[PDB]
């Protein structure tokens, strides 16, 4: 099958900047290739065709061009309906195939999270498991370093990740880590800390808890 | 128009046929495709089929179980889904060489095996102590271990929307969905307001209501 390596996996931009994303083919294609739009929660939308045919109704803003290997989609004057995600598909033989994606958002001014950690409730713990939550709040850009810390201890493997939305409001992400025991691992440690870095603080933030004393 | 139908919970190994009634063009003279798009990864084509049902063509990931056909007097496009693995969880949309809006198919049976839908435990998420210094504080509902997607999460019957987060769910290694709300709220109001997350899960007719406070 032929591998569309798309650049970048994201990309922050401001209303009306001029933007560049990039497909890179394991093989000659032709003009075999095109270009979609997805936002979230809905299907697919074709912007190019043929390289650099546009699609009737698509604003004249969106452009492509491209050889038979590197194919580019130019966005010029960026307007705010333009923040989604983008695909690259070639059609030249089977099996067609897209790109990895570009989730293009909206760059905005350096904000710091408020970082928080909840302990596990009792309720929780009777049924054998326990959730340590810590929490990110409103912070920009999206790029964080979440560590646990259990007695010190670092912590792997043991934890998810989930991330919201960009808010439509202040631009900012949200995110939060759980890390998951059982109840007889959790009750035979004592300290459970979470460490953040970010861009915005100017040393990493440490929330922590003390079993017995919570 | 496209509209995609037959999608919904199933279980591994067992089988599941989707339909794409087609409207508004000549069906008969366009080949159709079937794509589909796993949670938080990009598009995948699946299947096409030419436009008089002669020349079909697969993925590899699905050769020898999914099965393209058409019938172009019904102006209906089939997808046959056979020994389906978890990895084959997407939303599925054809598209005329128009998109439809897509069908979601999730493979797993997750939950138990004689009642794959499973309501939510709801914790609560509060500090251990009200912190001083810091004028904003943070509450929660941990919403977890459902089948299947989705649940919603409203505070204090709607009347608290400011400021609330409730994360996209993630897939455990159990099968069962998980999530969290979180809602920043004044650490002057810590311990004297109510703050009440309430949880629909409405494919196990699930209503929950549950207060967070410290004990």
């Known amino acids: 099958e032929i591998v569309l390596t798309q650049s970048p996996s994201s990309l922050s931009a401001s209303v009306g900047d001029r933007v560049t994303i990039t497909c890179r083919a394991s093989?000659?294609?032709?003009?075999?290739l095109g270009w979609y739009q997805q936002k979230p929660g809905k299907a697919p939308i074709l912007l190019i065709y043929?390289?650099?045919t546009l699609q009737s109704g698509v604003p004249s803003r969106f452009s492509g061009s491209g050889s038979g290997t590197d194919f580019t989609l130019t966005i010029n004057s960026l307007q705010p309906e333009d923040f989604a995600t983008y695909y690259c598909?070639?059609?030249?033989?089977?099996?067609?195939?897209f790109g990895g994606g570009t989730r293009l958002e909206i760059k905005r001014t350096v904000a710091a999270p408020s970082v928080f950690i909840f302990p596990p409730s009792d309720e929780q713990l009777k049924s054998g498991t326990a959730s340590v939550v810590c929490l990110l709040n409103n912070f920009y850009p999206r790029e964080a370093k979440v560590q646990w810390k259990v007695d010190n201890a670092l912590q792997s493997g043991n934890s998810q990740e989930s991330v919201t939305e960009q808010d439509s409001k202040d631009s900012t992400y949200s995110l939060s880590s759980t890390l998951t025991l059982s109840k007889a691992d959790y009750e035979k440690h004592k300290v459970y800390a979470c460490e953040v870095t970010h861009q915005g603080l100017s040393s990493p933030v440490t929330k922590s808890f003390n079993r017995g004393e919570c | 128009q496209l509209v995609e139908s037959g999608g919904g919970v199933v279980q591994p190994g067992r089988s599941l046929r989707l339909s794409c009634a087609a409207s508004?063009?000549?069906?008969?003279?366009?080949?159709m495709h079937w794509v589909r798009q796993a949670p938080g990864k990009e598009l995948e084509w699946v299947a096409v089929?030419?436009?008089?049902?002669?020349?079909?063509y697969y993925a590899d990931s699905v050769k020898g179980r999914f099965t393209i056909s058409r019938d172009n007097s019904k102006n209906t496009l089939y997808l046959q889904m056979n020994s389906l693995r978890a990895e084959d969880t997407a939303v599925y949309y054809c598209?005329?060489?128009?998109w439809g809006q897509g069908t979601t198919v999730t493979v797993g049976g997750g939950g138990s095996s004689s009642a794959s839908t499973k309501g939510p435990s709801v914790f609560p998420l509060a500090p251990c102590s009200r912190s001083t210094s810091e004028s904003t504080a943070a509450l929660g509902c941990l919403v977890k271990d459902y089948f299947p997607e989705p649940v919603t999460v409203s505070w204090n019957s709607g009347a608290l929307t400011s400021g609330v987060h409730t994360f996209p769910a993630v897939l455990q290694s159990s099968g069962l969905y998980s999530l969290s709300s979180v809602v920043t709220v004044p650490s002057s109001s810590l311990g004297t307001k109510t703050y009440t997350c309430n949880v629909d899960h409405k494919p196990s007719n699930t209503k929950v209501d549950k207060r967070v406070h410290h004990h």
């Open positions: 598209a005329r060489t128009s």
């Open positions: 508004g063009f000549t069906f008969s003279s366009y080949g």
């Open positions: 089929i030419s436009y008089d049902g002669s020349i079909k």
């Open positions: 093989q000659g294609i032709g003009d075999d």
């Open positions: 043929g390289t650099s």
């Open positions: 598909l070639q059609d030249s033989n089977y099996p067609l195939t």
